[PDB]
UniProtKB/Swiss-Prot annotation, chain A:
This is Large ribosomal subunit protein eL15A. GO terms for cellular component: cytosol; cytosolic large ribosomal subunit. The lineage of its organism: Eukaryota, Fungi, Dikarya, Ascomycota, Saccharomycotina. Residues 168-184 have a biased composition (Basic residues). GO terms for molecular function: RNA binding; structural constituent of ribosome. It comes from the Eukaryota. Component of the ribosome, a large ribonucleoprotein complex responsible for the synthesis of proteins in the cell. The small ribosomal subunit (SSU) binds messenger RNAs (mRNAs) and translates the encoded message by selecting cognate aminoacyl-transfer RNA (tRNA) molecules. The large subunit (LSU) contains the ribosomal catalytic site termed the peptidyl transferase center (PTC), which catalyzes the formation of peptide bonds, thereby polymerizing the amino acids delivered by tRNAs into a polypeptide chain. InterPro entries: Rbsml_eL15_core_dom_sf, Ribosomal_eL15, Ribosomal_eL15_CS, Ribosomal_uL23/eL15/eS24_sf. Residues 163-184 are annotated as: Disordered. One of its GO terms (biological process) is cytoplasmic translation.
Swiss-Prot record, chain C:
Component of the ribosome, a large ribonucleoprotein complex responsible for the synthesis of proteins in the cell. The small ribosomal subunit (SSU) binds messenger RNAs (mRNAs) and translates the encoded message by selecting cognate aminoacyl-transfer RNA (tRNA) molecules. The large subunit (LSU) contains the ribosomal catalytic site termed the peptidyl transferase center (PTC), which catalyzes the formation of peptide bonds, thereby polymerizing the amino acids delivered by tRNAs into a polypeptide chain. Belongs to the eukaryotic ribosomal protein eL13 family. One of its GO terms (molecular function) is structural constituent of ribosome. This is Large ribosomal subunit protein eL13A. The gene is RPL13A. It comes from Saccharomyces cerevisiae (strain ATCC 204508 / S288c) (Baker's yeast). It comes from the Eukaryota. It is found in: Cytoplasm.
Swiss-Prot record, chain D:
It holds the Pfam family Ribosomal_L36e. This is Large ribosomal subunit protein eL36A. PANTHER family: 60S RIBOSOMAL PROTEIN L36. Keywords: Acetylation, Cytoplasm, Ribonucleoprotein, Ribosomal protein. The gene is RPL36A.
Swiss-Prot record, chain E:
The gene is RPL28. The lineage of its organism: Eukaryota, Fungi, Dikarya, Ascomycota, Saccharomycotina. The chain holds residues 56 to 149 of 149 of the full protein. This is Large ribosomal subunit protein uL15. Belongs to the universal ribosomal protein uL15 family. There is a cross-link at K41 (Glycyl lysine isopeptide (Lys-Gly) (interchain with G-Cter in ubiquitin)). Component of the ribosome, a large ribonucleoprotein complex responsible for the synthesis of proteins in the cell. The small ribosomal subunit (SSU) binds messenger RNAs (mRNAs) and translates the encoded message by selecting cognate aminoacyl-transfer RNA (tRNA) molecules. The large subunit (LSU) contains the ribosomal catalytic site termed the peptidyl transferase center (PTC), which catalyzes the formation of peptide bonds, thereby polymerizing the amino acids delivered by tRNAs into a polypeptide chain.
Length: 203, 150, 187, 96, 94
RNA sequence: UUGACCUCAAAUCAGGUAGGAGUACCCGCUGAACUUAAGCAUAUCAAUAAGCGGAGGAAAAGAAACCAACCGGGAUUGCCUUAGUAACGGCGAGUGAAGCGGCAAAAGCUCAAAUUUGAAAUCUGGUACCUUCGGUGCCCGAGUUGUAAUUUGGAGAGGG
RNA sequence: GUUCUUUGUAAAGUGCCUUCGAAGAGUCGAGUUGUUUGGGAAUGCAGCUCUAAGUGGGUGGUAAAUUCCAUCUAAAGCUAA
């Protein structure tokens, strides 16, 4: 099948064929809106291993975000503080641009639930993403229990709490000795160890 | 026909205890894209038709290189819309034919000799040139007038 | 004396005092008693392996592990799929590379299937009067190293020069091998 | 084989070993028959990337010593530069 | 002051010491009076110093003349000499 | 000249859904200074108060790209302990984890990636009837740029 | 517990012999710049530039080269106490 040939040929992103497609498709994506509906995924293999199943109730959105840092919104660079916090242009915004891309399509299509997302194309001004969303009200999803777990109301707005694939990365949630400050969540393991525990019979 | 064929089998199964030899062997085009690519690389295909316009172009571009490798006589037909009509879909994007009836055998081998003369034989020198030198006609008249004057 | 206390933060916001210790104990025993009525013939916990601890300080002990293996369960004569229904924990990621631990867990399995009786699916359900602790029925036994008294055999190896030469051989192993190749590479 | 004393080249108790069944998730690296056929097919389609073009003009001119220094810096590390320049010797050998 | 030790863990350095003074409290109380009244090399009590939780055997006092088989990870020079005069071997266990 | 296809639209179209409130606890983002250092910029206060986004009866984490250096352990959480220790700091003031051990609770697993190819075997909707959190039968539709069945690395598949 | 309904030429499990064994990309990683905590020529995350491999890849708390050995299988996902 074309599963493996598409998997390998996408990896050669500087070959003479793909930089042709990367330069044609970057023109098309500027001419549309910031958020607009993709009728079908442009990368079908990469969509499919993330969980896309071509049936009724899986919606692909295409989104455009700004490249660059984050400039602090204080007026005229006057931070009013100890002479550290004067830094303005070097500030870097702890969430990635990928999770910012998931929130704009999330706040637009609010009935939909955002499943995952992936990279497509980039430019000096904009990065481009293509986001897979799931419809929880559609009857093909409320049945067939591979996917009825998303209709559970604890999965409301996964993209905004940081539970997606790039959400759990940016929080720094993996196993290991490196991730001590963030293994059970950062502010949970802060409050755990900055707490004076006092039993009845004092130890 | 399948809604006709199953009850035609079902009367044969209970009455005659037949092993579904009541249904003959089928011959039809094999049409799914992951199914055509699996029929190639086993050398099980006779002709592979390729639609030229596919909206994610990256899907199909390895097929003229893969059909040259395993030795299957590919063709690049025009239209994914035409290929859907012969196989009862809207769009098809490939159509491959494994087998053919024996009375129709000589008609196939004549057709393959015309197709390979255009596509599989030209494949050695298709790779050595680049397309896209066309310009707009206002720009095309601009340089032809100058080159005539120069 | 110098004394270090870390109380510069707003520490009075995060102070947890455990008045509920005597309260949570009564709630926890009612949790076990409610479970033991729901699971009414079954012994409230799964069966556990005999496992020797890591970390040179603790390797003399032996300890109840998580689950057996796929190898120890097959040696007793049952699949891993059926083993979880019997009450036997299965840990797929552990491996056996010792024999005395392997022989201890298998004998722990041969005893277990004799002590249990499994009811038929069909019915008639013989009343069995559950025993609430599977760990107390199959205790974890400390293995015995040696006998109490032996005879003295003495070879004069001096037992400290033994430790000394074993130390120096590790330290000077690498440089002596560099000498041993330079003799070999000559001419 | 451990010796049986506390310190040395082989410390620790002598116990009989079982050398158990090999885990399947150790052979993740070995490819297939099929993936070798796929990757050979994609390389002739895609062609060489632009820095790989700058290696095969550099090995033919300035030897393999300077080629590992550029391939150290375009890629990440030095041990990945061995895996790339060894591939570019296979490209020229297939050419001639 | 000295050099730094990144990632220190007190399992590498677990080694509690035992002097030759006690050496018999490891043996239980009721059997103790029998083993002190025998000079037999044929029946000598085996004391496993690791199982009681002692890393090293050090020589600090004087011990009686009964031969004793000792199992230990580490012994000093003077401790192994003082047991050898009593007629007791020191077997190294791991 | 009709008839498809692709992309893009409209309708008080058929049926649906989101916003707001609460906000003790939970997941993020953003983010100060008074204060301590007998000054102070560093550091501290603090990855905290304020501001903003999003949930539940719990949330979050979770079935190892783990800890280890052992005769080896075995998903995550919580407690006792490791420990005011290793470690970092105008090495000043100050800050400060994790692995083992005991215990509470215990539960595992699912896709992508294999041609059903001797048969898209799958699914929403519309309408009749019914034993209605649904079921059966016909008709359009989705769909071959991939919906079922089989497989998830502890394995597993194809022939015998 | 008691009662009438049998779903199945359906489904599951185990022994042996062979050929096999598909396993996630602007990602892992590196450079620099900011931010973070005990993480100490770099503990996380983020911006930009560069950008892999398949007996490979990550880690093994002092950088780099060279030779080994151990251990797990990342870049997709769910789940009570």
């Amino acid at each position: 099948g074309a599963y493996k040939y598409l998997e390998e040929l996408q990896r050669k992103k500087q070959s003479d064929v793909l930089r042709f497609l990367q330069r044609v498709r970057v023109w098309e994506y500027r001419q549309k809106n910031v958020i607009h509906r993709a009728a079908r995924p442009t990368r079908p293999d990469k969509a499919r291993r993330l969980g896309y199943k071509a049936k009724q109730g899986f919606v692909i959105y295409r989104v455009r975000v700004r490249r660059g840092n984050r400039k602090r919104p204080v007026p005229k660079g006057a931070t009013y503080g100890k002479p550290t916090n004067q830094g303005v242009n070097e500030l870097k915004y702890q969430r990635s641009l990928r999770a910012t891309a998931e929130e704009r399509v999330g706040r637009r299509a609010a009935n939909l639930r955002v499943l995952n997302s992936y990279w497509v194309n980039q430019d000096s001004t904009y990065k481009y993403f293509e986001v897979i969303l799931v419809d929880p009200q559609h009857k093909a999803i409320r049945r067939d229990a591979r996917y009825n777990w998303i209709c559970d109301p604890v999965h409301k707005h996964r993209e905004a709490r940081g539970l997606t694939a790039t959400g759990k990365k940016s929080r720094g949630i993996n196993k290991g000795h490196k991730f001590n400050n963030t293994k059970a969540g950062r502010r949970k393991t802060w409050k755990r160890q900055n707490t004076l525990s006092l039993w009845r019979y004092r130890k | 026909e399948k809604k006709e064929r199953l009850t035609k089998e079902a009367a044969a199964v209970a009455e005659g205890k037949s092993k579904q030899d009541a249904s003959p062997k089928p011959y039809a085009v094999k049409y799914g894209l992951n199914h055509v690519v699996a029929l190639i690389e086993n050398k099980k295909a006779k002709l592979v038709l390729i639609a030229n316009d596919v909206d994610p172009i990256e899907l199909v571009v390895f097929l003229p290189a893969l059909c040259k490798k395993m030795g299957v006589p590919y063709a690049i037909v025009k239209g994914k819309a035409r290929l859907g009509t012969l196989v009862n879909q809207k769009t098809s994007a490939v159509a491959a034919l494994t087998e053919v009836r024996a009375e129709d055998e000589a008609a196939l081998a004549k057709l393959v000799s015309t197709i390979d003369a255009n596509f599989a034989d030209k494949y050695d020198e298709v790779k050595k040139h680049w397309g896209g030198g066309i310009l707009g006609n206002k720009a095309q008249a601009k340089m032809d007038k100058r080159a005539k004057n120069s | 004396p110098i004394l270090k206390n870390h109380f510069r933060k707003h520490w009075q916001e995060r102070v947890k005092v455990h008045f509920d210790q005597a309260g949570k104990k009564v709630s926890r025993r009612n949790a076990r008693a409610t479970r033991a009525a729901k699971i009414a013939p079954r012994p409230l916990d799964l069966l556990r392996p005999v496992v020797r601890a890591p970390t040179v300080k603790y390797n003399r002990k032996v300890r109840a592990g998580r689950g057996f293996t796929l190898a120890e369960v097959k040696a007793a004569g049952l699949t891993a799929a059926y083993a979880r229904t019997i009450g036997i924990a299965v840990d797929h990621r552990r491996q056996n590379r010792n024999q005395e631990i392997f022989d201890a867990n298998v004998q722990r399995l041969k005893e277990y299937q004799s002590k249990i009786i499994v009811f038929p699916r069909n019915g008639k359900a013989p009343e069995a009067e559950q025993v609430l602790s599977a760990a107390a029925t199959f205790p974890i036994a400390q293995p015995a190293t040696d006998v109490e008294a032996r005879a003295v055999q003495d070879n004069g190896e001096s037992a400290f020069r033994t430790l000394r030469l074993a130390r120096s051989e590790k330290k000077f192993r690498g440089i002596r091998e560099k000498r041993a190749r330079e003799k070999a590479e000559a001419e | 084989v451990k010796t049986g004393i506390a310190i040395g080249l082989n410390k620790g108790k002598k116990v009989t070993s079982m050398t158990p069944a090999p885990k399947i998730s150790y052979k993740k690296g070995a490819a297939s028959n099929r993936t070798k056929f796929v990757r050979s097919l994609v390389r002739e389609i895609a062609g060489l990337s632009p820095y790989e073009r700058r290696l095969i003009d550099l090995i033919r001119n300035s030897g393999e010593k300077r080629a590992r220094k550029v391939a150290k810096k375009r890629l990440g590390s030095f041990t990945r530069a061995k895996a790339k320049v060894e591939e570019m010797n296979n490209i020229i050998a297939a050419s001639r | 002051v000295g050099m730094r030790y990144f990632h220190k863990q007190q399992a590498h350095f677990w080694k509690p010491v035992l002097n030759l003074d006690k050496l018999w409290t490891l043996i239980p109380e009721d059997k103790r009076d029998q083993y002190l009244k025998s000079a037999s090399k044929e029946t000598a009590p085996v004391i496993d110093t690791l199982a009681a939780g002692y890393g090293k055997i050090l020589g600090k006092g004087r011990i009686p003349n009964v031969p004793v088989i000792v199992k230990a990870r580490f012994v000093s020079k003077l401790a192994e000499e003082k047991i050898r005069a009593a007629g007791g071997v020191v077997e190294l266990i791991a």
